[PDB]
Amino acid sequence: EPLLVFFLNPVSSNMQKHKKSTNMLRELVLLYLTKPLSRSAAKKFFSMLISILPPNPNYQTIDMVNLLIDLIKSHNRKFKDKRTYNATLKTIGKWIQESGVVHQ
Amino acid sequence: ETRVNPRALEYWVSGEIHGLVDNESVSEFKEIIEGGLGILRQESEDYVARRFEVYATFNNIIPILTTKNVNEVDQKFNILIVNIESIIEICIPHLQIAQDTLLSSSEKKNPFVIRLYVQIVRFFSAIMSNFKIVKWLTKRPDLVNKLKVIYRWTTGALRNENSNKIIITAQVSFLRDEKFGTFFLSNEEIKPIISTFTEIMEINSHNLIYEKLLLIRGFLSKYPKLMIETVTSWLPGEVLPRIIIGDEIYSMKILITSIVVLLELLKKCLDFVDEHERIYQCIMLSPVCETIPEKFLSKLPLNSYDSANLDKVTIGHLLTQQIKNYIVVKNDNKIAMDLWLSMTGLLYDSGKRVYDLTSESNKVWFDLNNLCFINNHPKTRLMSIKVWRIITYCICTKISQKNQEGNKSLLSLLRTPFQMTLPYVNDPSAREGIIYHLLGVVYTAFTSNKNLSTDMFELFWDHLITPIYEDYVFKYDSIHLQNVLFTVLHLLIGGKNADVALERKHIHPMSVIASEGVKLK
DNA sequence: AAAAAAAAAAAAAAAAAAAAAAAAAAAAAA
DNA sequence: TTTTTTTTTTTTTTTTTTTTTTTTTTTTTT
């Protein structure tokens, strides 16, 4: 629910809203996965968190998505998945970045 | 350019071409199916070879349940419920000629017809197992009774000719997934099916026993009244020998699956009590050669005079021996006790057999529990008390006041866990087993027993609660244990200060059979 | 004139949601 | 150093509540 709002709040612009949002959206996920990566979660949360990536329009929203997607991709190199959903964990880059190089 | 054609001869080449691309999630899948049914219209110069491929692709463009969209299933199967009259004029005879050419000889491992026969059986299985087809069939019973011929031939195709490992597995997976009979076969139309469970062509390739035991599950939960009336056949003939022969002739998967079938019958047979007394008759009264077929006895690890006196070895003896090796050799303490449980309940639910618990020939079952309880593992020590839930249920539901000293003897044996745990009161798990047991006693004798009168209560009091509390409870220095053991008294008199239901309420005797058992609430 | 339509007013079938039950996988103890 | 069990998830089946049909009975055409 709140991650849906983290996308569309720039419909009414206000860089004062963005300037606090991107800072808090980093610290939200910093502790979401404090325990050493459940195998099932690497497919369960992974599947619904990609079922709604648009708007494909909205220039000042995609700024926020490109700034957060490589913060995730940073820990996906450090202490990811101790085997299991390796393959699907990199398909996150294949369709998300397809958006970020079609509307930017 | 789209020109593959849905009909004629152009689509299926002579070995492949299916259509799992743009017809996945799309209605147009229709013309591959309704196409193939048009190709089955006899003729049989070019169309005979191509009979192998049409029943292959039918097992490929069919969906699974797909929770993501249960409607793609609904809409793909909505073509079949319209085409069905055509499936019945051709696919039934095309199966029958493939079956009967496979039911005329012995050398018949012919890869044309036998590779087709399995593919046409899968095609019917996926039609029957679809529940929406089952609700729809009630609209026309003419078709129900035409379709009913599948079982009338399948029941011969298990116990006759050269029924191969693959032919059996395809027919058993069909009967496991079928669902159809519950709304379209009478109880007597089903007895010809159960009649085959004992009579199968022998090849204990593990594959085949695994699916055979899983069929018994589906049949117990969808056909309980029918399975119980016939238990004297399929249990001793083909399930019960699987455990006794041991792990070595099999694989642990097989042994565990034949233990689960015992628990399922228990969750569907106390409903009917077995007033026919089949249990004690075919197992503890009867020896080996009265109920076990030679088919399994030649494979059996016999030992001494027992091999020459199969007339005297009642099935309960040889079962009791095999349970003894699990604890003392393997350390398989859970498998030994969960098995042991299921037999004692079924055997003694009969309202006269409850008293057989007092007999010295039967106390070897308590000794067997004691040999588990002397082991190190606190979880094993708790579990060897967690099992006593059945001993409460039999002694406190199916009891008859008339046998005054019989009741008194059962009520004395029922305190045996407290005698075992008395030196072990230091241990956490040994304290907890006292509470779990005692909740089940109280619940079953007073809360779920409606028939308390005056007379039952007197047995449950100065012959039971007083001997519990004076001889065990008033001797434990464990104050937090005593706090809980006295709380159950407040509940029974009128102060129900024990949460009852905040958020996160047992009343029928089955409730004590559960893994959590019963609570103060 | 007799049979057919028109309208009260009870009656019968079945899908949803949550508890248990039970499974996968994850948390614990070697 | 790897075996064993518990929370999250799945499925059955109640228990409510709704959908729905079929009997009942006046006034005109078979």
The candidate with the shortest Cα–Cα distance to B512, out of B442, B463, B415, is B442
Query: Strand C contacts (CB < 7 A) among A residues 20-59?
Result: 35-36, 38-41
Interatomic CA–C1' length for residue A41 and nucleotide C27, angstroms: 15
Task: Evaluate whether B174 touches B216 at the Cβ level (below 8 Å).
Answer: no
For residue B355, list its beta bridge partners: none
Rounded CA separation B339/B259 (Å): 6
The dihedrals phi and psi of B287, each to the nearest 5 degrees, come to -75, 180
B334 nearest nucleotide via C1' and CA:
D4
B260 nearest nucleotide via C1' and CA:
C22
- Structure solved using which method? X-ray
Interatomic CA–C1' length for residue A35 and nucleotide D7, angstroms: 15
The candidate with the shortest Cα–Cα distance to B193, out of B230, B248, B247, is B230
B138 nearest nucleotide via C1' and CA:
C13
A45 nearest nucleotide via C1' and CA:
D8
Interatomic CA–C1' length for residue B371 and nucleotide D26, angstroms: 86
Tokens of B86: 């055509």
What resolution does the deposited structure have, in angstroms?
A: 6.5
Task: Evaluate whether B198 touches B237 at the Cβ level (below 8 Å).
Answer: yes
Task: Evaluate whether B340 touches B368 at the Cβ level (below 8 Å).
Answer: yes
**Could you say which DSSP state residue B314 is in?**
B
Rounded CA separation B165/B465 (Å): 58
Residues composing chain A: 104
Rounded CA separation B208/B202 (Å): 9
Helix (H) or strand (E) holding B175, with range, is helix B165-177
Interatomic CA–C1' length for residue B289 and nucleotide D26, angstroms: 78
Interatomic CA–C1' length for residue B319 and nucleotide D11, angstroms: 34
Question: How deeply is B324 buried, as exposed, middle or buried, from its count of CB atoms within 10 A (0-12, 13-18, 19+)?
Answer: middle
Interatomic CA–C1' length for residue B140 and nucleotide C28, angstroms: 57
Helix (H) or strand (E) holding B165, with range, is helix B165-177
B135 nearest nucleotide via C1' and CA:
C14
Contact residues for A13 (Cβ-Cβ < 8 A; gap 6+): A60
For residue A30, list its beta bridge partners: none
For residue B487, list its beta bridge partners: none
Rg (CA), chain B: 29
Residue with CA nearest C1' of nucleotide C22: B515
Counting Cα atoms < 13 Å in the Cβ hemisphere of B337 gives: 25
Rounded CA separation B228/B191 (Å): 12
**Could you say which DSSP state residue B304 is in?**
S
Q: Give the DSSP per-residue string, B369-435.
A: HHHHHTSS-HHHHHHHHHTTHHHHHHHHHS--TT-HHHHHHHHHHTTHHHHHHGGGTTSHHHHHHHH
B267 nearest nucleotide via C1' and CA:
C21
The greatest distance separating any two alpha carbons of chain A, rounded to the nearest whole angstrom, comes to: 43
Helix (H) or strand (E) holding A26, with range, is helix A15-32
Inter-CA distances, B186 with B146, B152, B179, Å: 15, 13, 13
- Indicate yes or no: strand C within 7 A of the C-beta of A2: no
Amino acid at B230: T
Task: Quickly count: other Cβ atoms within 10 Å of residue B379's Cβ.
Answer: 11
Interatomic CA–C1' length for residue B138 and nucleotide D26, angstroms: 38
Counting Cα atoms < 13 Å in the Cβ hemisphere of B315 gives: 25
B515 nearest nucleotide via C1' and CA:
C21
A38 nearest nucleotide via C1' and CA:
C26
Interatomic CA–C1' length for residue B183 and nucleotide D12, angstroms: 18
Nearest 5°: CA angle at B288, between B353 and B268?
45
Residues composing chain B: 521
Interatomic CA–C1' length for residue B406 and nucleotide D17, angstroms: 51
Rounded CA separation B40/B116 (Å): 14
For residue B287, list its beta bridge partners: B314
Rounded CA separation B288/B309 (Å): 9
Q: Which residues touch strand D (CB under 7 A)?
A: A 40-41, 44; B 67, 221, 334, 379
Contact residues for B97 (Cβ-Cβ < 8 A; gap 6+): none
For residue B348, list its beta bridge partners: none
State the residue for tokens 């003896």.
Answer: B317
Interatomic CA–C1' length for residue A34 and nucleotide C27, angstroms: 15
Tokens of B423: 């030196």
Rounded CA separation B241/A100 (Å): 64
Nearest 5°: CA angle at B243, between B239 and B267?
55
Task: Evaluate whether B384 touches B337 at the Cβ level (below 8 Å).
Answer: yes
Sign for the pseudo-dihedral over CA of B170, B171, B173, B179: positive
Positions of chain C reached by protein Cβ under 7 A: 14-15, 20-22, 24-27
Rounded CA separation B281/B231 (Å): 12
The candidate with the shortest Cα–Cα distance to B353, out of B364, B345, B341, B361, is B345
Task: Evaluate whether B181 touches B190 at the Cβ level (below 8 Å).
Answer: yes
Interatomic CA–C1' length for residue B136 and nucleotide D26, angstroms: 40
The candidate with the shortest Cα–Cα distance to B342, out of B421, B396, B283, B287, is B283
Interatomic CA–C1' length for residue B139 and nucleotide C7, angstroms: 30
A84 nearest nucleotide via C1' and CA:
C25
Interatomic CA–C1' length for residue B13 and nucleotide D13, angstroms: 48
The candidate with the shortest Cα–Cα distance to B403, out of B346, B463, B451, is B463
Rounded CA separation B343/B20 (Å): 50
Question: How deeply is B214 buried, as exposed, middle or buried, from its count of CB atoms within 10 A (0-12, 13-18, 19+)?
Answer: middle
Interatomic CA–C1' length for residue B340 and nucleotide D5, angstroms: 22
Sign for the pseudo-dihedral over CA of B288, B292, B293, B296: negative
State the residue for tokens 């743009």.
Answer: B22
Q: Give the DSSP per-residue string, B327-349.
A: IIII--HHHHHHHHHHHHHHHH-
Helix (H) or strand (E) holding A88, with range, is helix A86-99
Contact residues for B21 (Cβ-Cβ < 8 A; gap 6+): none
Contact residues for B508 (Cβ-Cβ < 8 A; gap 6+): B448
Query: Strand C contacts (CB < 7 A) among A residues 60-79?
Result: none
3-state DSSP percent of chain B in helix, strand and coil, to 5 = 65, 0, 35
Rounded CA separation B239/B224 (Å): 17
The dihedrals phi and psi of B357, each to the nearest 5 degrees, come to -55, -25
Residue with CA nearest C1' of nucleotide D4: B379
Task: Evaluate whether B200 touches B160 at the Cβ level (below 8 Å).
Answer: no
Inter-CA distances, B225 with B272, B291, B320, Å: 8, 22, 29
Rounded CA separation B313/B288 (Å): 6
Contact residues for B422 (Cβ-Cβ < 8 A; gap 6+): B472, B475
Interatomic CA–C1' length for residue B512 and nucleotide D12, angstroms: 20
Task: Quickly count: other Cβ atoms within 10 Å of residue A72's Cβ.
Answer: 12
Tokens of B482: 């005593």
Contact residues for A2 (Cβ-Cβ < 8 A; gap 6+): none
Rounded CA separation B62/B64 (Å): 7
Interatomic CA–C1' length for residue B397 and nucleotide D21, angstroms: 45
Helices (H), B47-164: 51-61, 70-101, 111-128, 131-137, 141-147, 149-154
Query: Strand C contacts (CB < 7 A) among B residues 346-375?
Result: none
Rounded CA separation B162/B244 (Å): 28
- Indicate yes or no: strand C within 7 A of the C-beta of A88: no
A40 nearest nucleotide via C1' and CA:
C25
Positions of chain D reached by protein Cβ under 7 A: 4-5, 8-9, 11, 13
Rounded CA separation A73/A79 (Å): 11
Rounded CA separation B205/B472 (Å): 54
Task: Evaluate whether B401 touches B407 at the Cβ level (below 8 Å).
Answer: yes
